[PDB]
Amino acid sequence: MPHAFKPGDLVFAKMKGYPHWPARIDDIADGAVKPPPNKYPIFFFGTHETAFLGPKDLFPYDKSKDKYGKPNKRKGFNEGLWEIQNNPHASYS
Numbered sequence: 001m002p003h004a005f006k007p008g009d010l011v012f013a014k015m016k017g018y019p020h021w022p023a024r025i026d027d028i029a030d031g032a033v034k035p036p037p038n039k040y041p042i043f044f045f046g047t048h049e050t051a052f053l054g055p056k057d058l059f060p061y062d063k064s065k066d067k068y069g070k071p072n073k074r075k076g077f078n079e080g081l082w083e084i085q086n087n088p089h090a091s092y093s
């Protein structure tokens, strides 16, 4: 059975006006800005941008990759595909 989301989990993350996007649940660094209650820090591969999302917008990567893991014209999306598949746990700093 599934657990709750935890840092390091891989997802496609959905934001308004964007296709479901390769992403991970991040850790919160000591001293770093925390997300709102019930929100997770989502790091988007390719763009390397962060947003705060709740589970309604988070699709586990293994289940979803056949549906959402195909090339996209959007800026950074194809780069993000490579990262989630090839080095999803790297520092992209």
Ligand SMILES: CC(C)n1cnc(S(N)(=O)=O)c1
Residues within 6 Å of the ligand: 015, 018, 021, 044, 045, 047, 048, 049, 050, 051
């Ligand atoms: C805040 C806004 C500019 N945005 C955050 N993440 C993306 S994305 N999913 O990486 O295309 C866009």
